């Protein structure tokens, strides 16, 4: 068994990936929440949403979709690994 | 990169501190998941992703 610092190295790898996925996903959620409040404001005044705004928003949604697919599996392996 | 550095950072922790980190990261996944789902409900009923028709 490969180890690093006394821990199984494949466990630390999955935790590394867990931490990194969550940090990116946090950034994406922050961008979505502000985009919603802008859009909420625009919609309240019957003002159009720019095409560029829609594109950026849709890009974040699809990126989140992939992060969540990676988060799944990684979360499973981390759970699987917690023998303790 | 900053990824191998994180891997080394984790391996240098005590067992108790690694476990707290795993628990914190799992809790963070759940909290972010609540945030994410709320903004997906908000965006749906603001129709941000309807295609232009006019």
């Amino acid at each position: 068994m490969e180890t690093l610092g006394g821990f199984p190295v494949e466990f630390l790898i999955q935790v590394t990936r867990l931490s990194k996925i969550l940090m990116i996903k946090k950034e994406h959620i922050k961008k979505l929440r502000e985009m919603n409040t802008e859009a909420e404001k625009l919609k309240s005044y019957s003002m159009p949403i720019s095409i560029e705004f829609q594109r950026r928003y849709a890009t974040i949604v699809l990126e989140l979709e992939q992060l969540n697919k990676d988060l799944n599996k990684v979360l499973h392996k981390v759970q699987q690994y917690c023998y303790e | 990169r900053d990824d191998i550095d994180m891997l080394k950072e984790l391996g240098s922790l005590t067992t108790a501190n690694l476990m707290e980190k795993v628990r914190g990261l799992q809790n963070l996944a759940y909290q972010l998941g609540l945030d994410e789902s709320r903004e997906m409900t908000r965006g749906k009923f603001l129709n941000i992703l309807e295609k232009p028709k006019k």
């Binding site: 890009t59 949604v61 992060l67 | 998941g33 994410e36 789902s37 992703l49």
Partner: peptide, 28 residues
Amino acid sequence: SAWKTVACGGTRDQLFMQEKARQLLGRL
């Protein structure tokens, strides 16, 4: 079991929004 629904972005409106995003961008 459903704790993953939240943790991994699987709620009904998120799957809906992902569908709209694919359509808006022209992706399968």
